[PDB]
């Protein structure tokens, strides 16, 4: 197993990453992101966007929904794939955009805590 990580946790929004290695292409890591909301109000029109360094390639698949419900009653699930031919240490910048408590929210953050198994 590749251990899971918390990629982001701020303002009542948590994003967890779980990982599997592809059996089709060993250079690919499939990341499943799970976004959860511990506050009292839904986070709507939720968009996750990632960016990885030049020697990596990224494919973002469709999310399960655009709402992170209040009280943690479910999650948004989105799969993203990373192609890492050179086996460089995986690292990523994420951008999170959503509405909460009436307001437009947006945050950019770095994810520099990937487990070695996710890229070696």
UniProtKB/Swiss-Prot annotation:
Quaternary structure annotation from Swiss-Prot or TrEMBL: Adaptor protein complex 1 (AP-1) is a heterotetramer composed of two large adaptins (gamma-type subunit AP1G1 and beta-type subunit AP1B1), a medium adaptin (mu-type subunit AP1M1 or AP1M2) and a small adaptin (sigma-type subunit AP1S1 or AP1S2 or AP1S3). Interacts (via GAE domain) with RABEP1. Interacts with EPS15. Interacts with SYNRG/gamma-synergin. Interacts (via GAE domain) with AP1AR (via coiled-coil domain). Interacts with CLN3 (via dileucine motif); this interaction facilitates lysosomal targeting.
Q: Which organism is it from?
A: Mus musculus
- Give every GAE domain span: 2-115
Q: From the Swiss-Prot or TrEMBL record, give the protein name.
A: AP-1 complex subunit gamma-1
The protein's location, in the record's own words, is: Golgi apparatus; Cytoplasmic vesicle, Clathrin-coated vesicle membrane; Cytoplasm; Cytoplasm, Perinuclear region
Instruction: Give the protein family.
Output: Belongs to the adaptor complexes large subunit family.
Describe its function. Subunit of clathrin-associated adaptor protein complex 1 that plays a role in protein sorting in the late-Golgi/trans-Golgi network (TGN) and/or endosomes. The AP complexes mediate both the recruitment of clathrin to membranes and the recognition of sorting signals within the cytosolic tails of transmembrane cargo molecules.
> Found in which tissues?
Widely expressed.
Record note on what altering residue 51 to D does: Strongly reduces interaction with EPS15 and SYNRG
């Amino acid at each position: 197993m590749i251990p899971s990580i918390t990629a982001y946790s701020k303002n009542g929004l948590k994003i967890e990453f779980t990982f599997e290695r592809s059996n089709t292409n060993p250079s690919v890591t499939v990341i499943t992101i799970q976004a959860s909301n511990s506050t009292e109000l839904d986070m709507t029109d939720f968009v996750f966007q990632a960016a990885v360094p030049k020697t990596f390639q990224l494919q973002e698949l469709s999310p399960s929904s655009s709402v992170v419900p209040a009280f943690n009653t479910g999650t948004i699930t989105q799969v993203i794939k990373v192609l890492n031919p050179q086996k460089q240490q995986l690292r990523m910048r994420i951008k999170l955009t959503y509405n909460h408590k009436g307001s437009a929210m947006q945050d950019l953050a770095e994810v520099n805590n990937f487990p070695p198994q996710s890229w070696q």
